[PDB]
Amino acid sequence: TVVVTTILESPYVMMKKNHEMLEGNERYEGYCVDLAAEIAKHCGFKYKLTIVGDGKYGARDADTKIWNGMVGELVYGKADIAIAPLTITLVREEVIDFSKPFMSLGISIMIKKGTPIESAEDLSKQTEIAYGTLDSGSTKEFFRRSKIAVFDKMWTYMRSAEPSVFVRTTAEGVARVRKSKGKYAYLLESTMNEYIEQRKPCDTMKVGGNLDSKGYGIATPKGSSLGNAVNLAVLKLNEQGLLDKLKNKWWYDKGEC
Amino acid sequence: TVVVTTILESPYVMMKKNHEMLEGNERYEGYCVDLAAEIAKHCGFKYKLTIVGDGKYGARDADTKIWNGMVGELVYGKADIAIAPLTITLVREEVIDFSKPFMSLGISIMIKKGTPIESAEDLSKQTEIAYGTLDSGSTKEFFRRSKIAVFDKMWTYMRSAEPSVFVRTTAEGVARVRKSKGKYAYLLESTMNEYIEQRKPCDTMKVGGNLDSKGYGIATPKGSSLGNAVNLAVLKLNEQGLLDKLKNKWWYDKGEC
Numbered sequence: 459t460v461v462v463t464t465i466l467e468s469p470y471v472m473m474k475k476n477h478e479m480l481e482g483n484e485r486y487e488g489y490c491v492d493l494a495a496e497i498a499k500h501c502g503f504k505y506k507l508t509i510v511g512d513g514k515y516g517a518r519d520a521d522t523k524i525w526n527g528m529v530g531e532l533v534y535g536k537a538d539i540a541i542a543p544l545t546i547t548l549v550r551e552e553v554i555d556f557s558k559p560f561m562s563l564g565i566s567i568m569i570k571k572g573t574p575i576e577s578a579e580d581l582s583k584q585t586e587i588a589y590g591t592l593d594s595g596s597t598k599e600f601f602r603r604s605k606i607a608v609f610d611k612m613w614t615y616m617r618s619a620e621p622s623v624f625v626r627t628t629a630e631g632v633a634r635v636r637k638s639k640g641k642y643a644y645l646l647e648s649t650m651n652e653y654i655e656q657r658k659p660c661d662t663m664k665v666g667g668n669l670d671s672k673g674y675g676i677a678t679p680k681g682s683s684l685g686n687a688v689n690l691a692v693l694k695l696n697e698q699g700l701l702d703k704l705k706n707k708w709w710y711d712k713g714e715c
Numbered sequence: 716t717v718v719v720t721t722i723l724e725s726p727y728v729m730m731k732k733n734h735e736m737l738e739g740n741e742r743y744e745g746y747c748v749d750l751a752a753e754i755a756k757h758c759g760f761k762y763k764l765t766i767v768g769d770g771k772y773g774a775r776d777a778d779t780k781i782w783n784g785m786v787g788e789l790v791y792g793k794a795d796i797a798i799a800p801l802t803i804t805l806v807r808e809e810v811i812d813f814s815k816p817f818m819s820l821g822i823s824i825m826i827k828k829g830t831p832i833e834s835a836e837d838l839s840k841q842t843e844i845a846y847g848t849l850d851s852g853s854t855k856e857f858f859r860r861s862k863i864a865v866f867d868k869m870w871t872y873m874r875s876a877e878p879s880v881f882v883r884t885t886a887e888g889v890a891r892v893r894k895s896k897g898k899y900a901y902l903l904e905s906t907m908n909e910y911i912e913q914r915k916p917c918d919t920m921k922v923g924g925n926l927d928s929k930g931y932g933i934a935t936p937k938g939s940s941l942g943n944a945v946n947l948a949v950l951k952l953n954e955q956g957l958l959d960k961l962k963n964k965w966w967y968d969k970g971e972c
């Protein structure tokens with residue numbers, strides 16, 4: 459039985475409303491729960507879904523050099539595979555193996571409906587509408603290291619804006635956009651932006667094209683015997699149109715706006 | 716070094732805005748962070764604050780018979796003491812020890828300012844203004860088992876109300892009160908009600924007296940070498956007026972309304 463590690467993040471993995479009457483894998487539902495079933499079917503294995511112990515995705519402590527979250531569970535042998543919205547990054551690819559991406563994404567802009575902003579360039583040219591990102595992570599790092607004029611201008615602003623424009627969590631960034639009467643725009647992953655856009659109170663909107671490109675991949679321990687099969691399954695699913703179908707179902711078919 | 720388990724719940728434990736520049740226990744602030752320092756001071760031990768991995772307080776699954784949250788961390792040896800807003804209950808006291816209560820609370824009513832409701836009696840006499848609680852937990856169970864008229868009347872209503880008046884999380888309940896335009900009242904722990912009342916946009920109000928009584932307590936494993944000292948520490952802090960100073964500090968001095 460393959461131990462799958464995942465994380466509670468809507469609409470990827472959520473508790474069914476009646477989860478208390480259920481048990482095992484049936485307690486969960488969502489995009490990744492559906493994806494796990496597909497992968498298992500094509501790779502030919504039985505599995506058990508478990509929620510990552512520390513509820514984190516995967517980062518290496520600069521001091522101890524220890525990995526936490528799902529990457530950690532894979533690295534230290536606590537799980538056999540990770541199916542969740544885990545970004546494929548150089549540092550993680552150095553310690554675990556990733557499948558080809560099952561979803562493509564990029565940094566995007568979230569605004570409260572009605573805000574007169576249509577792109578990052580628009581944000582960089584004005585001042586009365588503040589904007590920020592998570593206080594740590596790839597999105598913040600993207601701006602900090604950019605050599606592109608527009609993003610350099612945005613980073614210069616964000617790094618010294620007052621009050622601070624950074625937030626610690628997604629919920630924090632979304633709430634700020636929603637209570638700032640259009641005076642705050644949040645920079646986040648397009649997938650989350652797109653999801654929130656389809657959820658009540660339906661007062662946010664994703665604008666402009668993505669600022670960068672990346673994707674989520676299924677992860678397995680280095681030199682795992684599941685790596686090859688899982689990679690082929692992800693390609694087969696995309697070719698069959700199933701990845702797009704799954705995305706449309708959990709983002710739009712179940713939308714509230 | 717004593718391992719302390721706690722949970723990110725405002726204003727009990729929160730991440731300082733400059734946490735990325737701080738280390739260890741200094742990354743956190745809040746009522747329980749202050750309480751932990753006092754308890755360790757008077758008990759004479761060194762400690763390290765850790766956040767419970769699954770973000771839960773403590774319940775036993777009737778299936779697996781496994782304890783989750785902070786109670787689980789104590790019973791399975793992951794932490795030596797739990798310092799958080801953990802309600803003292805019979806089922807929990809059966810596996811861990813609780814200090815005398817450091818804070819008293821009870822079920823209360825939260826309304827959007829403007830709602831013509833001043834008590835549980837007012838709610839029980841009508842239906843235009845819907846009211847509910849978490850879909851699971853002590854508050855819901857309180858109503859389900861009550862033999863008291865008014866509470867029986869309230870439960871008789873809640874159990875058959877449509878759409879469902881129950882919510883999955885505190886955030887959901889609070890958000891529902893704020894966006895229901897005076898048509899939903901939320902029943903919750905007085906401590907959280909009093910806290911929300913002091914947070915922007917200052918659009919909610921706590922009405923009526925508590926419907927019941929209970930307390931939060933510090934938890935330690937059975938046979939812990941710290942059990943006795945922790946208990947005496949709580950009593951001394953109460954007698955010194957320290958517990959009330961901390962409540963006033965985190966609820967009102969730092970209040971925004």
Ligand SMILES: N[C@@H](Cn1ccc(=O)n(CCC(=O)O)c1=O)C(=O)O
Nearest residue numbers: 515516543544545628645646647650
């Ligand atoms: N892919 C990330 C984890 N992850 C997943 C989904 C998601 O929506 N967001 C962030 C959304 C936001 O920007 O608020 C995120 O950070 C990782 O690999 O660590």
Ligand SMILES: N[C@@H](Cn1ccc(=O)n(CCC(=O)O)c1=O)C(=O)O
Nearest residue numbers: 772773800801802885902903904907
């Ligand atoms: N004391 C509970 C945990 N706990 C702590 C703080 C709190 O505000 N609320 C609930 C607030 C609300 O009713 O929405 C709560 O359920 C336990 O011991 O499990």
Ligand SMILES: [Zn+2]
Nearest residue numbers: 496499500700
């Ligand atoms: Zn298939």
Ligand SMILES: [Zn+2]
Nearest residue numbers: 593594626735
């Ligand atoms: Zn941070």
Ligand SMILES: [Zn+2]
Nearest residue numbers: 753756757957
């Ligand atoms: Zn003292």
Ligand SMILES: [Zn+2]
Nearest residue numbers: 473477851883
């Ligand atoms: Zn539930």
